């Protein structure tokens, strides 16, 4: 199990990703707010 932490308002996760969503390495997970 690995966990990532980020700044308050310097990024935004993918709204489609909820709990139990399948996770593979090469896929995108979040995107900046700039």
């Amino acid at each position: 199990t690995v966990i990532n932490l980020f700044a308050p308002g310097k990024v935004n996760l993918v709204e489609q990703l909820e709990s139990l969503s399948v996770t593979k390495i090469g896929q995108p997970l979040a995107v900046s707010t700039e």
Partner: protein, 255 residues
């Protein structure tokens, strides 16, 4: 079902968690031709491991069980999103929870959240970098491929090792073990990246307990039982450390 869920949390709470880890870490680290292969064979059979994703699909080419456990995939089967404004997934698995960190509280399971200070072992300075922020908890099933890559181009700053217990870390525990990730032995990697300070942690389990990075090697074992802390330059320095998006940074192991 209630019996199994009972006995599952039962034997968990009572069995010598540290001692079972040692045996697997010593068994999976010794070399024996067919058993290691046969164990890998029964491992893939029972857990439905996708052996085709690997760079070496033949289970006989793995000397020990740990070498297969740290099997390298084919680089072409995990294509990295090259958009520099997005962050790639860390490693294969499933998501436990994710979302906003409501004032130094991070959701674990339904009716269970854990503190940010508790996760970072009292380092309040690091916690303030992530109060009212966002997080993502990613679980790795034994079937999954057990190395981690970077969500973005990052510069290594701090690393903090925490000694702790060795729990199952399967979901049945995550819904019943309070502060599961702040208790178990874990390794903290603090990063600098264009999207601000990013953290990436590595938490072990009741047998999957060994943690190693590409730059430091096998951190645990040995389990020494105290908090270790290193720091690194801030990039562009004699001895600075950085690494790219989707680049192999660490891996779990049996030990």
């Amino acid at each position: 079902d209630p019996m199994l869920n009972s006995f599952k949390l039962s034997l968990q709470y009572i069995l010598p968690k540290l001692w079972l880890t040692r045996l697997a870490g010593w068994g999976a680290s010794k070399r024996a031709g067919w058993l290691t292969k046969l164990v890998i064979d029964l491992f893939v059979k029972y857990y439905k491991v996708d052996m085709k994703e690997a760079q070496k699909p033949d289970t006989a080419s793995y000397r020990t069980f740990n070498e297969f456990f740290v099997r390298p995939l084919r680089d072409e089967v995990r294509p990295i999103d090259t958009d520099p404004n997005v962050l790639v997934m860390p490693a294969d698995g499933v998501i436990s929870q994710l979302g906003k960190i409501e004032e130094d509280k991070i959701l674990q399971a339904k009716g269970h959240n854990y503190s940010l200070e508790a996760l970072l072992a009292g380092n309040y300075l690091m916690a303030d970098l992530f109060r009212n922020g966002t997080f993502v908890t990613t679980y790795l099933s034994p079937r999954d491929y057990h190395r981690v890559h970077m969500p973005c181009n990052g510069i290594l700053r701090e690393m903090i090792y925490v000694p702790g217990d060795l729990f199952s870390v399967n979901h049945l525990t995550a819904q019943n073990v309070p502060n599961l990730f702040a208790r178990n032995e874990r390794v903290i990697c603090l990063f600098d990246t264009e999207f601000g300070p990013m953290a990436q942690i590595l938490v072990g389990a009741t047998i999957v307990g060994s943690i190693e990075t590409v730059w430091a090697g096998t951190i645990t074992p040995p389990r020494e039982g105290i908090i270790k802390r290193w720091t690194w330059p801030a990039g562009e320095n004699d001895g600075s450390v950085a690494l790219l998006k989707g680049q192999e940074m660490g891996r779990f192991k049996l030990g």
